[PDB]
């Protein structure tokens, strides 16, 4: 059998989730003889051949379509034709913003199995069994795909481990199907606002979320961060609201705090997208009045207490 992996690139760079998918594909296959086929799609995608000629890639297909970077019409048409060509048992896409634009469309047209944001996947005998979350990550939901000879999964980033080393795939070039896209990509744009601190470089963060309530409550945490010698960061709602600059936002659509050794998450529930920015932090302290908050599932230390009471007492003790 063949497992098909759709790589991802943007602005001339391969997104490393691509290599996680290769790891997943290799881990998933039932037999030595099964092959992993990777595809990379774009009008300039030959550039990625070296970076995808890696351990665990049996075939590497460069798909030349009409756009440089992701386009949903181009991608759906291209991946449909790859599925036709390779008859894969399993197709792995990253659960990324790009995949969101087409994965479920791809799956609506045909009789393919489909599940998204999957974080456990295995064969039980010949039966593919995927696990994803339910109810804001409070349960696991385990699914299978009865009768489906092709199953398309989107895979949660930062769960499956990449393989190490180079590889020697059979490299091929195909043109994408010739259908005109119903959209055209224009400028990339940097999220706006100030940039006085690069939060990917800082070692000690105090981070505020929706639990702070009103914008008038931001100042006391700014003070606390200053008194403590921490950098003030936030979850998406705080930055969406304009209360702190987007350069201070932690998580998938914000920044990954790669240098952070100590992260104090105050009034943050721990959504999967927030965690993407900070789950690697060696010492996470969570301060949150909801003991059911997802954040406690990755914190080293938990305090189920009011953030304002804690902040004022911390400020006093620090003084």
């Amino acid at each position: 059998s063949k497992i098909l992996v759709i790589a991802e690139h943007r602005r001339n760079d391969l997104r490393p989730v691509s290599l996680e998918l290769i790891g997943a594909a290799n881990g998933l296959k039932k037999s030595g003889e099964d092959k992993v086929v990777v595809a990379v799609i774009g009008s300039q995608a030959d550039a990625f051949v070296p970076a995808l000629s890696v351990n665990g890639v049996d075939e590497l297909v460069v798909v030349k379509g009409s756009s440089i970077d992701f386009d949903p019409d181009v991608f759906e048409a291209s991946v449909s034709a790859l599925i036709a060509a390779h008859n894969p048992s399993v197709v792995l896409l990253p659960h990324s913003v790009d995949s969101l634009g087409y994965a479920s469309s791809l799956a609506s047209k045909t009789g393919y199995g489909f599940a998204t944001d999957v974080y456990i996947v295995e064969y039980q005998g010949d039966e593919l069994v995927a696990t994803r979350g339910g109810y804001n990550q409070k349960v696991n939901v385990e699914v299978d795909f009865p009768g489906k000879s092709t199953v398309v999964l989107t895979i949660r980033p930062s769960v499956f481990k990449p393989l190490e080393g180079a590889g020697s795939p059979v490299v091929s070039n195909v043109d994408a199907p010739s259908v005109q896209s119903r959209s055209q990509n224009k400028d990339y744009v940097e999220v706006g606002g100030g940039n006085d601190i690069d939060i990917t470089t800082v070692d000690f963060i105090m981070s505020i979320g929706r639990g702070i309530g009103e914008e008038t409550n931001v100042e006391q945490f700014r003070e606390l961060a200053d008194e403590a010698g921490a950098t003030l960061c936030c979850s998406a709602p705080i930055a969406d609201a304009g209360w702190l600059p987007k350069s201070r936002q932690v998580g998938q659509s914000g920044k990954v705090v790669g240098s952070c050794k100590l992260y104090v998450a105050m009034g943050i529930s721990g959504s999967i997208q927030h965690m993407a920015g900070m789950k690697h932090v060696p010492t996470i302290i969570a301060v949150n009045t909801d003991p059911g908050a997802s954040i406690f599932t990755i914190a080293k230390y938990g305090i189920v207490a009011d953030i304002f009471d804690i902040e004022e007492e911390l400020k006093a003790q620090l003084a």
């Binding site: 479920s104 489909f114 599940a115 959209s183 999220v191 936002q249 302290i285 911390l314």
Partner: protein, 254 residues
């Protein structure tokens, strides 16, 4: 001019919730229901279009779900949606994102809107699939994770910004009519927490039990279970003792 906004009433769980005896879902007694957060932003975006326009813009909200959903639809009407539609029959129980996409499309075919808005994802299941599935059955242009929309009623193109990973956006010019999935933060919904709801059956939209429900979904639930998850080291006692431990941790770090 008409914008159709697909909305979901999501379920959040109370503490100490239990899995059903059949092991397929959580016991409904532990569920609290509300409008999906992403739908607040999508509905607000439609309303912003309505208000910016001299031309009439009909804003129609549509939901596939059982009678509990009428509460959420009523609240949408109270915020200025012009019409609200609930599609249901018990046979639709267990319908996944793709099947819901199909059901929605049957309503949309009849409403023939100029734009369709969906949320990026649901807070409960977070499939991030339903809206783009609609776009497939409609065969319409589409884009997911829209953080900005420049659109005037009647235009045959719109410019959107997709919110990408790592602090960048991408502008995309898209043919209209289109299906857009709308991201948190696109706007600031103004009503942050007698005309009836139109009730539609499967028969009303040409569907039957064999078109919907768990049997027609693209994956089968084997079980739902409370997994073992990581456990924090909880610091009990007084605010002073809790703060003192945080400071011991800061000093240990430095």
């Amino acid at each position: 001019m008409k914008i159709l906004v697909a909305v979901k009433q999501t379920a959040a769980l109370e503490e100490d919730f239990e899995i059903r005896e059949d092991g397929m879902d959580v016991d409904e007694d532990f569920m609290m229901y509300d409008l999906n957060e992403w739908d607040d932003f999508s509905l607000e975006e439609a309303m912003k279009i309505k208000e910016s326009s001299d031309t009439d813009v009909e804003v129609v909200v549509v939901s596939v779900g059982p009678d509990r959903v009428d509460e959420s639809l009523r609240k949408c009407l109270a915020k200025g949606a012009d019409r609200a539609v609930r599609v249901w029959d018990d046979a639709a129980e267990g319908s996944d994102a793709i099947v819901v996409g199909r059901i929605l499309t049957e309503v949309i075919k009849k409403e023939a809107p100029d734009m369709v808005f969906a949320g990026v994802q649901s807070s409960d299941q977070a499939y991030a699939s339903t809206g783009i599935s609609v776009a497939s059955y409609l065969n319409w242009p589409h884009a997911a994770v829209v953080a900005d929309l420049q659109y005037k009623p009647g235009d045959n193109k719109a410019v959107i910004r997709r919110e990408l990973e790592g602090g960048m956006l991408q502008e995309v010019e898209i043919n209209c009519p289109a299906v857009l999935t709308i991201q948190l933060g696109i706007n600031k919904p103004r009503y942050a927490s007698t005309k009836p709801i139109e009730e539609v059956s499967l028969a009303d939209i040409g569907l039957s039990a064999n078109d919907v429900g768990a049997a027609q979904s693209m994956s089968r639930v084997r079980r739902m279970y409370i997994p073992e998850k990581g456990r924090a080291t909880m610091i009990e006692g007084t605010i002073s003792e809790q703060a003192a431990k945080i400071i011991q941790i800061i000093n240990e770090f430095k």
